[PDB]
């Protein structure tokens with residue numbers, strides 16, 4: 005994909021698809037602001053204080069219209085922002101253009117190659133005068149991964165020669181090796197000034213705990229995914245909206261009456277099942293966790309192993325955050341034109357590589373991000389977004405109103421990481437702030453909260469203004 | 480209510496309504512055993528070990544057919560059991576009779592007075608030879624309350640002279656005064672031998688933390704309510720079944736098209752709203768917690784203050800565990816024959832006392848536990864179960880299959896309290912045991928659980944046999 009970079013001598017750097025989309029992007033941002041009252045009210049509340057004044061802030065998170073409102077909230081609070089997407093297909097090019105037109109470095113376009121993706125991550129982290137970010141907003145942990153690998157590779161450069169059998173890790177290694185030649189010691193220079201990362205998603209938080217357990221985490225992390233107002237809203241209701249949206253845009257297939265296999269029944273699987281059930285699909289669920297499996301049964305879904313429904317299901321959606329959920333031997337047995345997609349993580353929930361390399365397979369692009377793979381025996385499957393996040397790759401991701409929850413959490417997390425003294429570890433926002441995120445969205449919905457009386461507050465032993473629930477409450 | 484006590488010289492004591500109901504109770508217990516695979520498999524698993532051999536075990540928990548299977552599970556593991564109900568209307572007299580016919584002390588019948596209720600609690604706690612329980616199963620904390628008040632009043636008997644403006648506390652104080660006269664030092668004798676309590680319900684757990692906060696808890700407690708397989712199944716799906724069941728049995732009123740006000744949207748409120756929505760009611764929800772309120776909005780419910788639906792709703796259900804949810808000034812404004820009921824706690828969610836004492840009000844019993852209160856202006860309301868737990872008071876409570884979750888947790892909690900050396904505090908069962916509770920119920924449902932491969936287990940950093948989720952996971 006041919007891109008536009010900043011003119012020579014421009015005040016700031018960028019790389020996007022098309023700056024002429026800016027006016028359209030700005031119109032949709034204006035509409036989205038009205039749909040994001042929590043984010044806009046937080047922008048107003050902290051505006052005078054300027055809590056992020058001058059902070060070098062790098063974000064690696066889907067460059068959508070919703071993220072544009074987050075970027076401009078962080079800027080309204082004083083931050084000096086650079087941004088890239090965290091997925092090669094998730095950028096909305098009009099959002100990127102509108103943000104560049106406002107003067108902000110963005111390195112993101114829809115349809116990046118993997119090489120381009122990591123080059124964009126580097127451009128985002130590299131601030132002028134060979135500086136780095138003082139705070140990072142991350143979704144999936146790729147920016148955090150690059151910082152850590154760059155730092156540890158400066159101590160032991162041989163790790164840049166072990167790709168672990170991963171073509172993508174080879175890309176990262178080659179980039180880091182080039183940076184060692186161009187900017188020796190860069191990562192050791194910038195890590196002491198990087199005061200924290202706020203991480204958006206379940207897989208990114210898992211990566212943070214891998215690092216913290218090995219004693220390798222280099223700076224504090226705020227787990228935004230596990231705010232109640234994120235995990236229980238974005239992951240559930242966001243996917244309820246955006247999964248079926250993407251399937252409809254990509255394929256225009258009727259869901260009603262079809263068997264749809266949802267693999268996983270965590271937060272994303274729960275919302276995904278509801279997304280399809282609302283259209284009259286008969287949803288069947290796979291799970292490894294017996295509690296989640298029992299929840300699916302109590303919702304009226306049949307709990308199956310994938311092999312049990314290869315002759316029945318015509319839609320498969322992976323939601324696990326795990327590897328090798330839909331294997332090549334499964335796809336060999338699927339019904340003709342069965343739709344195969346992933347809403348969980350990266351691209352390894354489906355064995356996309358083994359599918360592409362299957363002997364004698366023929367690939368036909370129906371349209372961008374919709375690929376029919378025809379097997380020699382004559383049956384085909386339809387893969388969406390090359391097995392990457394389908395809601396963002398084939399539609400527009402979650403709608404603004406729910407992203408206002410997630411991004412109010414991100415804003416408060418950035419403020420907290422900057423103002424508070426966190427030790428090395430992974431933290432969550434206090435429950436009273438989590439409650440505030442929800443509270444800010446009630447007025448637009450016409451929802452009126454009841455206020456505890458003095459007698460009731462004493463009876464329950466809680467304050468009228470919260471927090472209302474014990475620390476361990478599950479909602 | 481005329482009761483039957485054991486014959487003079489009987490091997491054991493009891494007080495129930497009618498022993499002739501035993502054969503009917505036993506038939507329903509036989510059916511319920513098939514619906515409770517978690518309990519029945521737990522019997523087989525721990526049968527040889529006899530982990531509760533000889534343990535004096537007192538239960539204060541709704542004397543239902545489901546509790547009969549729990550009692551006989553505890554006995555099948557060796558326990559020496561005595562039982563009473565924790566609510567004056569919740570006993571199923573046939574269940575009580577079937578358990579007495581099997582040789583077990585039960586002090587419970589449907590329609591006790593408050594004085595009789597506390598006399599039954601005392602008969603349950605008092606073991607032969609002036610002994611007490613070594614373990615307690617409690618639901619709502621009444622037995623735990625009596626033990627603590629008995630112990631502390633032996634140090635300061637003037638505690639028994641302060642009724643605190645409560646007729647029911649006056650009943651407890653009068654009984655404790657008699658026990659001080661008949662058996663001085665009884666509570667100081669039995670407390671050192673009482674190894675723990677396992678508490679079934681949200682309100683009882685709240686009481687445990689209040690005692691912990693005051694430094695007054697006298698023995699360890701296992702919080703059964705907050706097992707995942709209890710709170711997210713019993714409190715939710717149990718009420719989804721048993722709320723509408725009770726409303727239908729009590730009133731035979733069509734829910735479809737009516738506005739039904741559910742006050743509270745925690746676990747019980749969530750299940751209650753689903754109970755009514757399934758019949759085409761238009762559910763409106765009240766809440767003090769903005770997170771729970773936002774969840775209700777995302778489910779398509781209008782969130783209101785009760786005052787905005789007094790001219791609309793014809794059903795009101797309190798689910799809060801809090802006091803003074805439905806006030807007399809609300810009931811004065813309700814639509815004619817509006818149904819008013821409580822599925823939360825005790826009898827103070829609705830201002831039943833103020834209703835009974837309202838000037839000029841007329842009470843007409845339609846049938847047991849269904850009372851029409853006719854106001855002087857001609858409008859009436861229909862109060863269910865005198866404002867006590869409506870599912871247990873006007874129907875049969877939760878169905879056996881979901882109680883198998885709760886009662887497998889109770890069984891495991893009793894085993895744990897007996898075998899492990901807990902300190903003074905409130906504890907929950909380990910996640911792997913919580914998962915086991917769910918796993919035991921999958922076969923009857925036909926659910927097929929997937930097993931992680933070695934590669935997937937390594938990828939996620941978990942064991943193939945669990946636990947599958949972080950400690951703080953909310954499901």
Ligand SMILES: NC(=O)c1ccc[n+]([C@@H]2O[C@H](COP(=O)([O-])OP(=O)(O)OC[C@H]3O[C@@H](n4cnc5c(N)ncnc54)[C@H](O)[C@@H]3O)[C@@H](O)[C@H]2O)c1
Nearest residue numbers: 205206207268270271272290291292293324325326348349
């Ligand atoms: N695309 C989006 O917009 C979006 C939104 C939120 C989160 N996410 C991503 O979605 C993924 C899931 O997130 P979550 O919050 O639902 O996590 P979760 O832990 O709540 O749920 C994942 C579930 O997958 C199950 N699972 C794991 N391996 C399995 C297997 N082999 N077969 C069947 N089930 C299996 C687990 O038991 C678990 O219940 C993560 O990668 C997360 O980052 C994506």
Ligand SMILES: NC(=O)c1ccc[n+]([C@@H]2O[C@H](COP(=O)([O-])OP(=O)(O)OC[C@H]3O[C@@H](n4cnc5c(N)ncnc54)[C@H](O)[C@@H]3O)[C@@H](O)[C@H]2O)c1
Nearest residue numbers: 680681682743745746747766767768799800801822823824
């Ligand atoms: N009848 C049954 O079979 C049964 C089953 C389970 C639990 N319970 C009982 O039900 C009650 C609720 O339990 P839970 O697990 O749902 O507790 P919970 O804490 O999950 O929910 C209670 C909800 O009530 C809300 N609330 C409190 N005061 C309010 C007010 N004035 N107006 C509106 N909302 C208000 C709280 O914000 C909370 O979300 C407890 O008393 C519990 O012991 C009964």
Ligand SMILES: Nc1ncnc2c1ncn2[C@@H]1O[C@H](CO)[C@@H](O)[C@H]1O
Nearest residue numbers: 066068070071204205238400401402
């Ligand atoms: N419209 C969107 N804009 C930005 N991020 C999104 C959008 N929809 C979903 N996401 C995020 O993508 C993450 C997965 O990488 C989810 O945790 C979710 O918060």
Ligand SMILES: Nc1ncnc2c1ncn2[C@@H]1O[C@H](CO)[C@@H](O)[C@H]1O
Nearest residue numbers: 541543545546679680713875876877
């Ligand atoms: N059928 C039943 N038998 C015994 N206890 C029940 C039944 N239905 C509901 N309960 C319990 O009553 C408690 C409320 O006192 C709930 O926590 C729930 O576990």
Ligand SMILES: [K+]
Nearest residue numbers: 400401402403
């Ligand atoms: K969107």
Ligand SMILES: [K+]
Nearest residue numbers: 875876877878
């Ligand atoms: K029942």
